[PDB]
């Protein structure tokens, strides 16, 4: 079944990427979230040039990413509403450096934005730094992170994939892996946030 | 400049926005940035050049340090107004814009800022293609 976890503000997953560093020309991140809180970090990967930061900021989905030689930031929100309405919301972020040509896509529920541009020079996506889900250490300097709150809510089917591997982070947390470490204790379901 | 042929699409069932951007180096210490965008549906869109310090935020609002300025802008908007038949006003807007920015070359770290306010979703995004330069 679905891999879910409830974060209460003092918990987060930490997947170690040092031994098996990820490197690819494209990657993709998907997850579903449910929350009542206006601010909180949902995931961050990359303590280096490249990184992806996905958070709730004042009830809006905030995305901050490095894209090769460039940077990209988006803020997404329903009209006459917020995403912290205690309902599931689906997020997908794709990054591509195939030709050089840079391309970023983000969808939240019924809005999709695809942005790109020709870029001659070209690097790699990924990092050897940890993968944080639902929060991060208080003393961690996470680039491109506009929020400092840990997440309070439910995260479902958090997945990272590139051209080489597909990491099912929520499932790995629920089941266990030598590279997956959990700060604190979380129930692997979606508890009544209300 | 480290980039060219910018393109962006922002899509909901209520509004579709298509943007292209092109850079022309005039070889005289100045360069132009041209944007064209077309939108069909309901809502407001905008594309502009901004400095990297521009805060990404929602905003109901529509020089000396920043050395890019608009020199020409042309906007054509066509509105079809009909009675909603889920409840007899529904409208469809078709917008086509062209904007010419002129930038002075002693500085080049420039960002593209896009805002999208429809009837179901809103979105702001800042793209800095050569930020790491």
Author numbering:
A (entry chain A): 280 to 378, 383 to 386, 394 to 484
B (entry chain B): 119 to 180, 189 to 214, 217 to 261
The authors write:
Neurexins are presynaptic, cell‐adhesion molecules that specify the functional properties of synapses via interactions with trans‐synaptic ligands. Our data reveal a unique, extensive, neurexophilin–neurexin binding interface that extends the jelly‐roll β‐sandwich of LNS2 of neurexin‐1 into neurexophilin‐1.
In the structure of the Nxph1‐LNS2SS2A+ complex, the 384‐HAM‐386 sequence of SS2A extends the N‐terminal part of LNS2 β9. Specifically, in the Nxph1‐LNS2SS2A+ structure, but not the Nxph1‐LNS2SS2− structure, L376 points into the core of the molecule toward L346, which shifts along with the backbone of β7 further into the core of the molecule. In addition, there is a shift of Y407 into the core of the LNS2 molecule in the Nxph1‐LNS2SS2A+ structure. Taken together, these structures show that SS2A adds specific inter‐molecular interactions to the Nxph1‐LNS2 interface while also inducing regional conformational changes to stabilize the complex. Indeed, Nxph1 binds to Nrxn1 LNS2SS2A+ with ~6‐fold higher affinity than for Nrxn1 LNS2SS2−. For example, the Nxph1‐LNS2SS2A+ interface contains the same key I401 residue found interdigitating with Nxph1 at the Nxph1‐LNS2SS2− interface.
